[PDB]
Amino acid sequence: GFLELERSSGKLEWSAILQKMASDLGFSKILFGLLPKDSQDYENAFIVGNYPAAWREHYDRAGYARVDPVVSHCTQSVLPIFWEPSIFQTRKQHEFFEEASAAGLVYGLTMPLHGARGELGWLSLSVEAENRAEANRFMESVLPTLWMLKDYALQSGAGLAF
Amino acid sequence: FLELERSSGKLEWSAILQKMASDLGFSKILFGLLPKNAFIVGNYPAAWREHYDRAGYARVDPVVSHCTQSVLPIFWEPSIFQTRKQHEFFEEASAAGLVYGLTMPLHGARGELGWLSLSVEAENRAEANRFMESVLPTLWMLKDYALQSGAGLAF
Amino acid sequence: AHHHHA
Ligand SMILES: CS(=O)(=O)c1cccc(OCCCC(=O)N[C@H]2C[C@@H]3C[C@@H]3C2=O)c1
Ligand SMILES: CS(=O)(=O)c1cccc(OCCCC(=O)N[C@H]2C[C@@H]3C[C@@H]3C2=O)c1
């Protein structure tokens, strides 16, 4: 239930529970990330999930936090952003998404996380599909469940992390 | 949710929100949003709102303290009113017709702080809980849509 | 319709 998330008593158990939940929902790769209030110390964010390690290292080395339109969206909004080609507008954002696809991150969405004590983060989930139409159909079918999941993960994850 | 997000002014926005809450079965709502003197909409009884401020109930109401610590909803249950002041508080709320309901905390991307409170009419708490749980996934999306669009309108 | 880009 969303219950065993709150009940988990360790980051490793918690991570495993959240991973299984996303997998069970039909998502492929996830990244849950959380920082405390007024922080850009991305290098020490609480990070859970199975995003490819090579992508995570590439992202940090290339300074993509400053390029990725998902990150700037999350600083402005509580609403989800789907990884639509139309959000990768500048040349640097276009190249970023090309690189993302080499790492297998082609279809997906991110839920911004904004916590009660100012925590800031994201829950990103990738979908494996034959085409974007199929991927968007799947994500829309599970979005109401995901919308609750992201706040349960935010609340319980922030308690374990900070 | 689109016509909420597309509303032109606060009065139109408030009317849409109220109707959406009624369509989910809620008779009384209060939406409040403080910036990082708040933005207030709803149809809570005016006399309750005045009493609440005058009595300084913001420092007593367990819903308020919950909202400052959590993003998860809190249902108005006896078990959350503990102190003595908190029982008197819930007794007066009953006089205003606020017996069953829940509050969704609001935490905006720009640090806005608020609440979306919704009251339901029911014969008993078990029935009220069924009513609320049956629409909670929709309410969970609504509260973030209302947060985003309301913050943009009021600030 | 749930896609947003701020
Ligand atoms: C995992 S990390 O190395 O510790 C790290 C370090 C610094 C910042 C991090 O946030 C990334 C989260 C935002 C996100 O998911 N954007 C999508 C957009 C596109 C398909 C592909 C993505 O990646 C993560
Ligand atoms: C509307 S106001 O007068 O401008 C005003 C001014 C200052 C603070 C305000 O937040 C109070 C909102 C929290 C809430 O709904 N708790 C429920 C708990 C219980 C049945 C009874 C309630 O009331 C509202």
Side-chain angles (χ1 to χ4, degrees), chain B residues 75-111:
Chain B
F75 288 71
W76 307 344
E77 307 203 308
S79 55
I80 80 176
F81 303 100
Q82 307 182 11
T83 66
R84 296 286 293 172
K85 293 179 179 179
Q86 289 181 338
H87 280 81
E88 311 170 13
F89 167 79
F90 201 43
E91 276 181 3
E92 283 166 352
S94 173
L98 301 170
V99 174
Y100 306 118
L102 77 180
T103 298
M104 281 281 334
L106 305 184
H107 296 290
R110 286 82 167 199

Short mmCIF file of all heavy atoms in Angstrom, two decimals, chain B residues 75-111:
data_model
loop_
_atom_site.label_atom_id
_atom_site.label_comp_id
_atom_site.label_asym_id
_atom_site.label_seq_id
_atom_site.Cartn_x
_atom_site.Cartn_y
_atom_site.Cartn_z
N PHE B 75 -7.80 14.34 7.56
CA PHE B 75 -9.23 14.25 7.76
C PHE B 75 -9.58 14.77 9.15
O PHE B 75 -8.83 14.55 10.10
CB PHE B 75 -9.70 12.80 7.62
CG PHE B 75 -9.67 12.29 6.21
CD1 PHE B 75 -8.46 12.03 5.58
CD2 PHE B 75 -10.84 12.07 5.52
CE1 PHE B 75 -8.43 11.56 4.28
CE2 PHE B 75 -10.81 11.60 4.21
CZ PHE B 75 -9.60 11.35 3.60
N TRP B 76 -10.71 15.47 9.24
CA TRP B 76 -11.15 16.08 10.50
C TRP B 76 -11.71 14.98 11.40
O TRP B 76 -12.92 14.73 11.43
CB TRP B 76 -12.19 17.16 10.25
CG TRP B 76 -11.80 18.22 9.26
CD1 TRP B 76 -10.54 18.51 8.78
CD2 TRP B 76 -12.69 19.15 8.63
NE1 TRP B 76 -10.61 19.57 7.89
CE2 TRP B 76 -11.92 19.97 7.78
CE3 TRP B 76 -14.07 19.35 8.69
CZ2 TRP B 76 -12.50 20.98 7.00
CZ3 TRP B 76 -14.64 20.34 7.91
CH2 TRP B 76 -13.86 21.14 7.08
N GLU B 77 -10.85 14.34 12.11
CA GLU B 77 -11.32 13.27 12.94
C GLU B 77 -11.14 13.61 14.41
O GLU B 77 -10.25 14.39 14.77
CB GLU B 77 -10.57 11.97 12.63
CG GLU B 77 -10.61 11.66 11.17
CD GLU B 77 -10.40 10.21 10.89
OE1 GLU B 77 -9.39 9.67 11.39
OE2 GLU B 77 -11.24 9.63 10.17
N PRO B 78 -11.98 13.05 15.29
CA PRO B 78 -11.83 13.33 16.73
C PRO B 78 -10.41 13.15 17.22
O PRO B 78 -9.93 13.93 18.04
CB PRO B 78 -12.79 12.32 17.38
CG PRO B 78 -13.81 12.03 16.33
CD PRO B 78 -13.08 12.10 15.01
N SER B 79 -9.71 12.12 16.71
CA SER B 79 -8.37 11.79 17.17
C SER B 79 -7.34 12.89 16.93
O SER B 79 -6.26 12.82 17.52
CB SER B 79 -7.91 10.48 16.52
OG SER B 79 -7.98 10.53 15.10
N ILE B 80 -7.63 13.89 16.09
CA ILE B 80 -6.67 14.97 15.88
C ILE B 80 -6.91 16.15 16.81
O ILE B 80 -6.03 17.02 16.94
CB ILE B 80 -6.63 15.49 14.42
CG1 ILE B 80 -7.79 16.45 14.14
CG2 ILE B 80 -6.63 14.34 13.42
CD1 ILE B 80 -7.75 17.07 12.74
N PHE B 81 -8.07 16.22 17.46
CA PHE B 81 -8.37 17.28 18.42
C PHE B 81 -8.11 16.72 19.82
O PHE B 81 -8.90 15.93 20.35
CB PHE B 81 -9.80 17.78 18.25
CG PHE B 81 -10.10 18.27 16.86
CD1 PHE B 81 -10.76 17.46 15.95
CD2 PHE B 81 -9.70 19.53 16.45
CE1 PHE B 81 -11.03 17.89 14.68
CE2 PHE B 81 -9.95 19.97 15.17
CZ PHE B 81 -10.62 19.15 14.28
N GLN B 82 -6.98 17.12 20.41
CA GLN B 82 -6.47 16.48 21.62
C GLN B 82 -6.57 17.38 22.84
O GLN B 82 -7.24 17.03 23.81
CB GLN B 82 -5.02 16.02 21.39
CG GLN B 82 -4.84 15.16 20.15
CD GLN B 82 -3.40 14.69 19.98
OE1 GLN B 82 -2.58 14.82 20.89
NE2 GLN B 82 -3.09 14.13 18.81
N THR B 83 -5.90 18.50 22.81
CA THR B 83 -5.97 19.36 23.93
C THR B 83 -7.41 19.68 24.21
O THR B 83 -8.30 19.37 23.46
CB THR B 83 -5.19 20.66 23.72
OG1 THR B 83 -5.79 21.43 22.70
CG2 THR B 83 -3.78 20.37 23.35
N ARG B 84 -7.61 20.36 25.32
CA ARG B 84 -8.91 20.76 25.73
C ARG B 84 -9.37 21.85 24.81
O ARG B 84 -10.46 21.81 24.35
CB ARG B 84 -8.89 21.22 27.19
CG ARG B 84 -8.53 20.11 28.16
CD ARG B 84 -9.67 19.11 28.35
NE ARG B 84 -10.80 19.72 29.03
CZ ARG B 84 -12.00 19.17 29.21
NH1 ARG B 84 -12.27 17.95 28.79
NH2 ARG B 84 -12.94 19.86 29.85
N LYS B 85 -8.56 22.87 24.62
CA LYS B 85 -8.87 23.93 23.66
C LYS B 85 -9.27 23.35 22.32
O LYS B 85 -10.14 23.90 21.64
CB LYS B 85 -7.65 24.84 23.50
CG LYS B 85 -7.28 25.66 24.71
CD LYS B 85 -6.05 26.49 24.40
CE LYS B 85 -5.68 27.34 25.61
NZ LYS B 85 -4.46 28.17 25.40
N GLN B 86 -8.65 22.23 21.92
CA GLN B 86 -8.93 21.64 20.61
C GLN B 86 -10.29 20.96 20.57
O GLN B 86 -10.93 20.93 19.51
CB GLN B 86 -7.81 20.66 20.23
CG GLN B 86 -6.50 21.38 19.88
CD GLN B 86 -5.37 20.47 19.46
OE1 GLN B 86 -5.35 19.27 19.77
NE2 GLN B 86 -4.40 21.03 18.74
N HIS B 87 -10.77 20.43 21.70
CA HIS B 87 -12.14 19.92 21.74
C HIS B 87 -13.16 21.05 21.67
O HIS B 87 -14.11 20.98 20.89
CB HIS B 87 -12.35 19.08 23.00
CG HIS B 87 -11.83 17.69 22.89
ND1 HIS B 87 -10.49 17.38 23.06
CD2 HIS B 87 -12.45 16.52 22.60
CE1 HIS B 87 -10.32 16.08 22.89
NE2 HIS B 87 -11.49 15.54 22.61
N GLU B 88 -12.99 22.08 22.50
CA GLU B 88 -13.86 23.25 22.37
C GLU B 88 -13.86 23.75 20.94
O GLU B 88 -14.91 24.10 20.39
CB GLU B 88 -13.41 24.38 23.30
CG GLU B 88 -13.15 23.98 24.74
CD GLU B 88 -12.48 25.09 25.54
OE1 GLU B 88 -12.45 26.25 25.05
OE2 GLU B 88 -11.98 24.81 26.65
N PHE B 89 -12.68 23.80 20.32
CA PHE B 89 -12.58 24.27 18.94
C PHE B 89 -13.48 23.47 18.02
O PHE B 89 -14.25 24.03 17.23
CB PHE B 89 -11.13 24.19 18.48
CG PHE B 89 -10.96 24.35 16.99
CD1 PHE B 89 -10.99 25.60 16.42
CD2 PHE B 89 -10.75 23.25 16.18
CE1 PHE B 89 -10.83 25.76 15.05
CE2 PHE B 89 -10.58 23.40 14.82
CZ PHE B 89 -10.63 24.66 14.26
N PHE B 90 -13.37 22.14 18.08
CA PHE B 90 -14.17 21.30 17.19
C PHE B 90 -15.65 21.40 17.54
O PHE B 90 -16.51 21.35 16.65
CB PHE B 90 -13.65 19.86 17.25
CG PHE B 90 -14.02 19.02 16.04
CD1 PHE B 90 -13.92 19.53 14.76
CD2 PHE B 90 -14.46 17.71 16.21
CE1 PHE B 90 -14.27 18.75 13.65
CE2 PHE B 90 -14.80 16.92 15.11
CZ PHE B 90 -14.70 17.44 13.83
N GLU B 91 -15.98 21.62 18.82
CA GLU B 91 -17.38 21.83 19.19
C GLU B 91 -17.95 23.08 18.54
O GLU B 91 -19.09 23.09 18.07
CB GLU B 91 -17.51 21.94 20.72
CG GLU B 91 -17.61 20.63 21.46
CD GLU B 91 -17.77 20.83 22.96
OE1 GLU B 91 -17.86 22.00 23.40
OE2 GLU B 91 -17.80 19.83 23.71
N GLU B 92 -17.18 24.17 18.51
CA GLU B 92 -17.69 25.37 17.87
C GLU B 92 -17.79 25.19 16.37
O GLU B 92 -18.78 25.62 15.75
CB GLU B 92 -16.82 26.57 18.22
CG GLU B 92 -17.09 27.08 19.63
CD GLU B 92 -16.02 28.02 20.10
OE1 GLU B 92 -14.99 28.15 19.40
OE2 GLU B 92 -16.20 28.62 21.18
N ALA B 93 -16.78 24.56 15.76
CA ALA B 93 -16.86 24.28 14.33
C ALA B 93 -18.15 23.55 13.99
O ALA B 93 -18.79 23.85 12.98
CB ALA B 93 -15.64 23.46 13.89
N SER B 94 -18.56 22.61 14.84
CA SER B 94 -19.82 21.90 14.63
C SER B 94 -21.00 22.86 14.58
O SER B 94 -21.93 22.66 13.80
CB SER B 94 -20.02 20.86 15.73
OG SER B 94 -21.29 20.27 15.62
N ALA B 95 -20.98 23.89 15.43
CA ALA B 95 -22.09 24.84 15.46
C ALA B 95 -22.22 25.56 14.12
O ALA B 95 -23.33 25.95 13.73
CB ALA B 95 -21.89 25.86 16.59
N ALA B 96 -21.10 25.72 13.42
CA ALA B 96 -21.05 26.30 12.09
C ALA B 96 -21.26 25.27 10.99
O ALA B 96 -21.19 25.63 9.81
CB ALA B 96 -19.70 27.00 11.87
N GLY B 97 -21.49 24.01 11.34
CA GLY B 97 -21.74 22.98 10.35
C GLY B 97 -20.52 22.32 9.77
O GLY B 97 -20.63 21.59 8.77
N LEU B 98 -19.35 22.53 10.36
CA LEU B 98 -18.11 21.93 9.87
C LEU B 98 -17.81 20.68 10.69
O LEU B 98 -17.00 20.70 11.62
CB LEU B 98 -16.98 22.95 9.91
CG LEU B 98 -17.27 24.21 9.10
CD1 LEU B 98 -16.22 25.24 9.43
CD2 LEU B 98 -17.31 23.95 7.57
N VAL B 99 -18.49 19.59 10.37
CA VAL B 99 -18.41 18.37 11.17
C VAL B 99 -17.52 17.32 10.51
O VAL B 99 -16.68 16.70 11.16
CB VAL B 99 -19.82 17.80 11.44
CG1 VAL B 99 -19.72 16.46 12.12
CG2 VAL B 99 -20.64 18.77 12.29
N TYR B 100 -17.72 17.09 9.21
CA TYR B 100 -16.96 16.10 8.47
C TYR B 100 -16.23 16.79 7.34
O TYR B 100 -16.78 17.69 6.71
CB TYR B 100 -17.87 15.03 7.86
CG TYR B 100 -18.78 14.36 8.86
CD1 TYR B 100 -20.15 14.46 8.74
CD2 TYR B 100 -18.26 13.60 9.90
CE1 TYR B 100 -20.98 13.84 9.66
CE2 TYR B 100 -19.08 12.98 10.81
CZ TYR B 100 -20.44 13.10 10.68
OH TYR B 100 -21.28 12.48 11.59
N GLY B 101 -14.99 16.39 7.10
CA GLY B 101 -14.26 16.98 5.99
C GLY B 101 -12.79 16.63 6.06
O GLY B 101 -12.36 15.77 6.83
N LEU B 102 -12.02 17.33 5.23
CA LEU B 102 -10.58 17.13 5.16
C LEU B 102 -9.93 18.40 4.64
O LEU B 102 -10.59 19.27 4.06
CB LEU B 102 -10.21 15.94 4.25
CG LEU B 102 -10.26 16.09 2.73
CD1 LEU B 102 -9.85 14.78 2.04
CD2 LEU B 102 -11.62 16.51 2.23
N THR B 103 -8.62 18.50 4.86
CA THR B 103 -7.84 19.62 4.39
C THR B 103 -6.64 19.09 3.62
O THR B 103 -5.95 18.18 4.10
CB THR B 103 -7.39 20.51 5.55
OG1 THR B 103 -8.57 21.02 6.19
CG2 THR B 103 -6.58 21.67 5.04
N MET B 104 -6.42 19.63 2.43
CA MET B 104 -5.22 19.34 1.65
C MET B 104 -4.22 20.46 1.88
O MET B 104 -4.55 21.62 1.60
CB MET B 104 -5.55 19.22 0.17
CG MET B 104 -6.18 17.89 -0.21
SD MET B 104 -4.86 16.64 -0.34
CE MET B 104 -3.48 17.71 -0.73
N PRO B 105 -3.03 20.19 2.42
CA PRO B 105 -2.04 21.26 2.55
C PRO B 105 -1.61 21.72 1.17
O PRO B 105 -1.59 20.93 0.23
CB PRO B 105 -0.88 20.58 3.29
CG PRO B 105 -1.47 19.39 3.96
CD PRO B 105 -2.57 18.93 3.02
N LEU B 106 -1.28 23.01 1.06
CA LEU B 106 -0.77 23.59 -0.18
C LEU B 106 0.64 24.11 0.05
O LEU B 106 0.86 24.94 0.93
CB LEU B 106 -1.69 24.71 -0.67
CG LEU B 106 -3.15 24.32 -0.85
CD1 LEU B 106 -3.90 25.47 -1.44
CD2 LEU B 106 -3.28 23.08 -1.74
N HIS B 107 1.60 23.62 -0.74
CA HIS B 107 2.98 24.09 -0.70
C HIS B 107 3.43 24.40 -2.12
O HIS B 107 3.72 23.49 -2.91
CB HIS B 107 3.88 23.06 -0.01
CG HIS B 107 3.50 22.85 1.42
ND1 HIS B 107 3.71 23.82 2.39
CD2 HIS B 107 2.88 21.83 2.05
CE1 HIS B 107 3.27 23.38 3.55
NE2 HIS B 107 2.74 22.18 3.37
N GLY B 108 3.48 25.70 -2.43
CA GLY B 108 3.75 26.15 -3.78
C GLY B 108 5.23 26.11 -4.14
O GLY B 108 6.11 26.08 -3.28
N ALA B 109 5.47 26.12 -5.45
CA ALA B 109 6.84 26.09 -5.95
C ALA B 109 7.63 27.32 -5.52
O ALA B 109 8.86 27.25 -5.36
CB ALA B 109 6.83 25.98 -7.48
N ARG B 110 6.96 28.47 -5.35
CA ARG B 110 7.61 29.69 -4.90
C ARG B 110 7.48 29.90 -3.40
O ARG B 110 7.65 31.03 -2.92
CB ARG B 110 7.06 30.91 -5.64
CG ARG B 110 7.50 31.04 -7.08
CD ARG B 110 6.67 30.17 -8.00
NE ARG B 110 6.87 30.52 -9.40
CZ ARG B 110 6.03 30.20 -10.38
NH1 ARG B 110 4.93 29.52 -10.10
NH2 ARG B 110 6.29 30.55 -11.63
N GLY B 111 7.18 28.84 -2.64
CA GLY B 111 7.08 28.92 -1.20
C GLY B 111 5.73 29.34 -0.65
O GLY B 111 5.59 29.50 0.57
#
